[PDB]
Amino acid sequence: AAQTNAPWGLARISSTSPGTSTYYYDESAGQGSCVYVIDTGIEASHPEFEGRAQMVKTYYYSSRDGNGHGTHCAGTVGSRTYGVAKKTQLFGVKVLDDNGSGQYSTIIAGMDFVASDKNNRNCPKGVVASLSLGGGYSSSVNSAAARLQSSGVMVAVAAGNNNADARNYSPASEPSVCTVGASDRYDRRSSFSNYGSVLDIFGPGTSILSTWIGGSTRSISGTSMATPHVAGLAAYLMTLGKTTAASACRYIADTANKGDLSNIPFGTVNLLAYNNYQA
Numbered sequence: 001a002a003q004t005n006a007p008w009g010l011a012r013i014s015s016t017s018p019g020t021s022t023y024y025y026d027e028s029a030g031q032g033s034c035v036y037v038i039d040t041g042i043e044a045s046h047p048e049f050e051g052r053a054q055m056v057k058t059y060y061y062s063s064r065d066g067n068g069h070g071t072h073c074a075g076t077v078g079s080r081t082y083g084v085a086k087k088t089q090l091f092g093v094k095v096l097d098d099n100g101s102g103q104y105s106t107i108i109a110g111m112d113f114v115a116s117d118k119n120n121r122n123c124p125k126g127v128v129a130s131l132s133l134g135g136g137y138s139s140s141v142n143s144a145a146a147r148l149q150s151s152g153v154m155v156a157v158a159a160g161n162n163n164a165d166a167r168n169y170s171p172a173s174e175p176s177v178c179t180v181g182a183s184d185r186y187d188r189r190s191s192f193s194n195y196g197s198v199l200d201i202f203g204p205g206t207s208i209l210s211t212w213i214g215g216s217t218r219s220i221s222g223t224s225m226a227t228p229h230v231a232g233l234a235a236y237l238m239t240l241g242k243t244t245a246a247s248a249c250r251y252i253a254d255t256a257n258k259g260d261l262s263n264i265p266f267g268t269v270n271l272l273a274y275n276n277y278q279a
Contacts, residue, residue, distance in 0.1 A: 001027045002279065007082055008185045009204030009229055014275050016257060018187045024279050026240055030085025033235040034123035035077045036114045036153070037130050037228070038107075039070030040100055042092035046071065048079035048211045053090035057113050059106045066098030068213040072220060073132040075211030076228035077235070082210040082217070084232025084275075085239070088128075091121065096133060104141050104170075107133065111144040115151040126238040126245050130231035131157040131171060132224035138170040145171035154238070154245040156180055156231040158223035159194035166194035173198050178234075178249030182206060182226040183272060188262045193223055195268040200249050202261055203229035203273045230273045237275070 003010065006023035014024040036056075043065050044053045053074055055063035065071045070092060078088040095110035096102040111129070118127045129148055134157065135141075149155040155177035159166040166172040172179045172194065179198050182190035182205020189195065190205045203226030209219040210228075234248040243251035256271035264270045 001025055007209045009208050010084060012204050013084065013229060013233060013273050014277050018185060024277050025236065025275060026277055028239050030078065030088030030232065030235040030239045032125035033085065033128065033239045034089045034091060034118070034121055035085065035128040035130055035231055035235045036091045036093055037070055037074040037077060038093040038095055038110050038114065039073050039132050040067035040096040040098060041065035041070045041094035042074040042090060043071045043213045044092070046211050046215055048075055048081055049090060050080055052078060052088065053092065055092040055094065056117060057110065058094035059109065060094060060097055063092065063094050065213050067100050069100055069132065069224065070094070070096070071213050072210045073130055073224060073228040076208060076225065077130055077232040079211050084229055085235040088232070088235045089123070102133065104135065104138055108141055108144040111148045114153060115148045118153060127153045128231050128235045129153045129155050130228045131155065132227045134158050134160050134169050134172050136170065137168050137173055141170040142174040145174040146176045149177045152245050154178065154234045154248045156227050156234065158227045159199050161192040161222050162194055163192050164194055165196035166198050167196050169194065178230060180223060180227045180230045182223040183261055187260050189264055190221065192221070195265045197267055199268055201230055201253055201256060201271050201273050202226065233273050233275055
C-alpha cells in the first residue's frame with residue numbers, strides 16, 4: 001500500500017532516503033496484533049482510530065486522556081492517517097495523569113497489568129507495549145520493563161529527551177527492552193534525544209504529526225514520539241511473521257538503515273527504524 005502525503009516520519013520508516021512523503025507498507029498493517037500504549041490514556045472516540053483504540057485500565061479518576069500525549073502516541077502507532085500499523089489494536093493504560101505525571105509505582109503497576117492483561121486480549125500476531133515515558137534511573141521500573149518484555153510483550157521505551165546518556169534514566173536503561181532515540185527529517189539526531197550504548201534504534205522524533213485530544217491533530221517533538229514509530233513498526237513486523245516479541249528489537253536493528261544519521265555520538269548505534277517494505 002501507499003499513503004501519499006504521509007507525515008514525514010511514516011515516509012521515513014519505509015524509505016532508504018530522507019525527504020520523501022509517501023508511506024509504503026504491506027496492507028496487513030498490523031492486523032491481528034496489539035499495541036499497549038502506557039501513557040496518559042487514549043481518546044478512543046477519535047475518528048482516526050476507527051474503533052480499534054480503547055481504554056483498558058486507569059489508575060486515576062478517569063481513563064480519559066486529558067493531556068493529549070497518549071492520544072498522540074497511539075495515533076503514531078495505529079491511527080489510519082498517522083499510524084505505522086493502521087490495523088493494529090490499541091489498548092490504553094493510563095499510568096500518567098493529565099499533567100503527564102505519574103508515580104513510578106503506578107507506572108510499575110501498569111507494566112505488570114499489561115503483562116497479565118494480554119491474556120485477556122486476542123493478539124494472535126503478538127503484543128507490543130509503547131512506553132513514551134521515563135524519569136531518573138530506577139532498578140524497579142527497569143525490572144518491571146524487563147518482566148513485561150520477559151512476559152512475551154515487545155517493549156519499546158523512549159531514550160529520554162535530556163540530550164544525555166540514557167544510562168541514567170528508566171526504563172530507558174533496561175537493556176532487555178527496546179530503547180528508542182529520536183531523529184529529525186534531515187536524518188540528524190534530534191537535539192534533545194538521549195544517546196548511549198543502551199539505545200537500540202532511532203525513530204522519527206522531531207515534529208511528528210499525529211492525533212490529539214478534542215478530535216484534532218498536532219505536531220510535537222520527543223523520544224516519546226519516536227517510540228510509537230518503532231512500537232507500531234514491531235506490531236507491523238510481527239503481523240507479517242517476520243519476527244516475534246522476544247526478537248523484534250534485535251530484528252528491527254538488523255534491518256534498520258545503517259549509518260544514515262548525523263550527530264550520533266561515538267558508541268551509540270547509528271540505526272534508523274526501517275520497515276524494509278518493497279512495494
